[PDB]
């Protein structure tokens, strides 16, 4: 949801497990070509920026799915960002 | 159809997967030169604007093909735009 | 042959072993510069699109060579595409 | 079959014996270069992701072979995923 | 503020972390299209010049935000430029 | 409204996001030919002058629409000009 | 020779490796400024049209040199054109 | 806590009991995939660098857990770093 | 000084670092609009001709500044022209 | 200091333990994103070139820190370069 | 010297170690911006063409330096070209 | 010699001992940076392709040395390729 737009820079600079999120979002929110495009970036911030480049086309449901995956993978990061 | 005409600005500013649409429209609606010209644009909004630059010569069938390609690629974007 | 033009989008989106095709087509259909240009692409669809960008100059024989390389590499993909 | 596409994330995150599956799929579905490429990944999830990167070129028969190999190797994993 | 105007050439030729500044300015001073336009430049000086091309529309507050982001990112560069 | 006529020179010399304004005014205030004519103009001040060349045929409503688009795109410029 | 004048449209629409031809013609037929002007075009047909714009000043020898470069680069394209 | 950030280089170059720390942090701070990724490094400094690569996503509690595990495992190293 | 008027054609045909000179001359002798106009040219000779298009309004001091910038950027060209 | 600018090529071609220097410069001279970007390069010369890619933003103090790290790591290399 | 001018096409198409030449020419013949611009090209021929684009400003000394660097790096290539 | 160009694909796909060839070609034909770049590839075909990427700069003597090394290491492979 609006959480990923409000904390865009922090999520880009602090998310460390991107492959799990990519697997969670594969097929339903991300196409296979976008999946490879994100996986081709050298560093984690580069992968996060490539993933965020696809967000303008997303609706509320896709952002909700991403935030749910974030809670499942990094609960502590989401808790820190909310606090 | 008229959908891509009434939502021109939103489609320009929110479509993120342009290469798939170009491949879908290649040969049937876009010539090779137009395909290369669209592919040569720097950013996604520039690519999508270059794509609409060819729309005045399209009939209802070409617009329907583009709408079908958008539905297959980004169902959520089309659902959000309709809503 | 006409097969690679009829199934251009599917070949772009589904070919997974591009290096073998590049080695097969090197020297006789592809120059060294075009070879390096194709290998420079990040993802498999990007490599396939770069390879297809050289197809306008190809005659029937070059397309036949590409189809033969595809049959040797991915027999199952060609069989699925034909049916 | 469609089983490996329905449970892609779970199969990536839970398959522990990848070398046996690579032996089962060698030659028939996997080329030697793809064999080496998958075998060179550091971790089991990395190996599974690299193997799944070749799935877009597969037809139903190759996926059936992979599912049969999974049933022979990890019957319990397949039963758990089905349940 | 006037700091980036009196040190335009030095900032163009010496700023090395442009993505961090872009992330800091995203959503408040730079639009998404401008973000992609700056991000698409080949070299760091090109990115800096593209970013500076948008400065005529900026007020004092936007320039202050850019200066504060620079101070967060490169304290040493700002200290050297002031000295 | 009269705002764009009071600050014509400043708007010409300081507006940096012209494509967004063109998309906002497309169809409603700007014809397709006028859109291409503005878009083919090389530099941003020159594009703004080309766009302003169509203002003599505008009523209060079109000027208000342009002002609203400017407020949505670059607010800081708007309060800078008002102040 | 007369070959490039007879097949001007096909050469414009089908030549894919313009950089090699430019390097072959550099210094002897093309000046540095013309070389840079041709290299600055977006797409291959645009590059070919820009190069052909210099042909009115060429004699038979320059056209023969261009034909020899084409034969060395893409023999199959020449054979297709003659056939 | 801030201890592991203050002594990052010393901890990377001096920690010799990494598998025990991985066991301590498994499940609650480290995912299974991250555990495998850390265990795949050849040398102890490489393992420590891979482990520290995940610290940007950690909050204060995770760093406290890591410090407590370090105190349990190698108290002499911690007291030496304090002095 | 008179150096750039004596070697106008050679400077047009041989200067390859135009952006550095533009940055050096920005604000002091070049306005923003002229800066964008010069950067909008396709090739280096075209950019340098656009730069000389503004020289009739320059006095000795501006030409001296341009010569000093040229000496700082590309000295070897300066001694080559003087010799 | 000026030492790393005087011996840039030799330092690029002869430094063998880039990781130790990166750990020494982490945080105070290098950000985390730049740290990952440097560690993502294939070979030691590539890593060291990526490291010098950030040097234009450095002041004298950062270069002094790098020289001190080099002295601590490879005293023989520094002694040979000075001699 | 004139060697790189009479063998321009062969040097563009056959030079394989470009980074070493860039390091050799950095700081005395090439500026930092030109260095980054050359390093940003995808393939070796593209890098060589970008490097040659700066040659019009070079005098005999810079070309001699480039030839000396080529002899130090690839003696066999220079020997083959001379023969 | 011409043997390594006639059997490029077979040599890429069938050579299994690459470190021995790299050591044989080290210093004489391969620089240290090229040695590291080739050695950093994941799989044997990748290493062979990276090594072949440097072939365009080689003369007949370098290819003769490579063929001699291949004969010394894999006599059976060379004998099979001859027939």
Please give, one letter per residue, the 3-state secondary structure of B6-53.
HCHHHHHHHCCCHHHHHHHHECCCECHHHHHHHHCCCCHHHHHHHHHC
Is H52:H12 a contact under the CB 8 Å cutoff? yes
Which chains sit next to L, with 3 or more Cβ pairs under 8 A? C, D, J, K
Spatial contact of I29 and I58, defined as CB atoms under 8 Å apart = yes
Q: Which of E20, E27, E36 sits opposite A8 (nearest CB)?
A: E27
Tell me how far CA of residue J13 lies from CA of A50, J65, K75, L25, in angstroms.
32, 20, 19, 19
- Local structure of C69: helix, strand or coil: helix
Tell if the CB–CB gap between G19 and K45 is shorter than 8 Å.
Answer: yes
Distant-in-sequence, close-in-space partners of F44: CB < 8 Å, separation ≥ 6? E53, F15, F16, F18, I36
CA nearest neighbour of F52 among F25, F73, F28, F27? F25
Contact at CB, E40 and B43, closer than 8 angstroms: yes
Q: Do B44 and E36 touch (CB under 8 A)?
A: yes
Q: Which residue of D has its CA nearest to H41?
A: D42
Question: In angstroms, what separates the C-alpha of B61 from chain A's closest C-alpha?
Answer: 24
What is the C-alpha to C-alpha distance for residues K26 and K32, in angstroms, rounded to an integer? 7
Q: Are J26 and H9 a contacting pair at CB < 8 A?
A: yes
> Between D33, D56, D62, which is nearest C13 by CB?
D56
Q: Which two tokens stand for residue D41?
A: 């990944």
> Are F2 and F64 contacting, i.e. CB atoms less than 8 angstroms apart?
no
Using an 8 Å CB-CB cutoff, list chain L residues near J42: 36-37, 40
CATH at J49? 1.10.533.10
Contact J36 A43 (CB under 8 A): yes
C19–D33 C-beta distance less than 8 A: yes
- CB spacing of K27 vs J5 below 8 angstroms: yes
Method used to obtain the model: cryo-EM
Q: Token match 């102040």: residue?
A: F83
SS3 F63: helix
With an 8 Å Cβ cutoff, are B9 and F26 in contact? Answer: yes
Residues of E in contact with I19 (CB under 8 A): 45, 49
Quickly count: other Cβ atoms within 10 Å of residue I71's Cβ: 13
Name the minimum distance, in Å, from the CA of L82 to any CA of chain K: 27
Q: What is the 3-state secondary structure (H, E, C) of chain A?
A: CHHHHHCHHHHHHHCCCHHHHHHHHECCCECHHHHHHHHCCCCHHHHHHHHHCCHHHCCHHHHHHHHHHHHHHCHHHHHHHHC
Q: Say if CB K72 and CB K15 are below 8 A apart.
A: no
User: Tokens standing for D81?
Assistant: 């995923």
Distance to chain C for A78, nearest Cα, Å? 31
Other residues' Cβ atoms within 10 Å of the Cβ of residue K79: 12
Nearest to J60 by CA among J16, J11, J4: J4
DSSP E16: -
Question: Among I1, I3, I6, I42, which residue's Cα sits nearest to residue I18?
Answer: I42
Domain with I46 in it? 2-82
- Angle E67-E73-E79 from CA coordinates, rounded to 5°: 65
Number of domains in chain F: 1
What size, in residues, is chain B?
Answer: 83
* Whether G and B touch (3+ CB pairs < 8 Å), yes or no: yes
Instruction: Report the C-alpha gap between G47 and G50 in whole angstroms.
Output: 5
State the Cα–Cα distance between residues D68 and D76, nearest whole angstrom.
13
Please give the torsion angle defined by the CA atoms of residues H9, H11, H17 and H18, in that order, rounded to the nearest 10 degrees.
-70
Interface of L with J (CB under 8 A): 32-33, 36-37, 40
Q: Report chain L's terminal Cα–Cα distance, integer Å.
A: 17
Look at residues J68, J72, J48, J51 and name the one whose alpha carbon lies nearest to residue J60: J68
Contact assignment for D12 to A27 by CB distance below 8 Å:
no
């Amino acid at each position: 949801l609006h959480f990923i737009d409000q904390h865009r820079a922090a999520l880009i600079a602090r998310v460390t497990n991107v492959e799990w999120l990519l697997d969670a979002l594969y097929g339903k929110v991300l196409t296979d070509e976008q999946y490879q495009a994100v996986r081709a970036e050298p560093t984690n911030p580069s992968k996060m920026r490539k993933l965020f480049s696809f967000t303008p086309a997303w609706n509320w449901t896709c952002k909700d799915l991403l935030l749910q995956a974030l809670r499942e993978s990094q609960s502590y990061l989401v808790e820190d960002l909310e606090r």
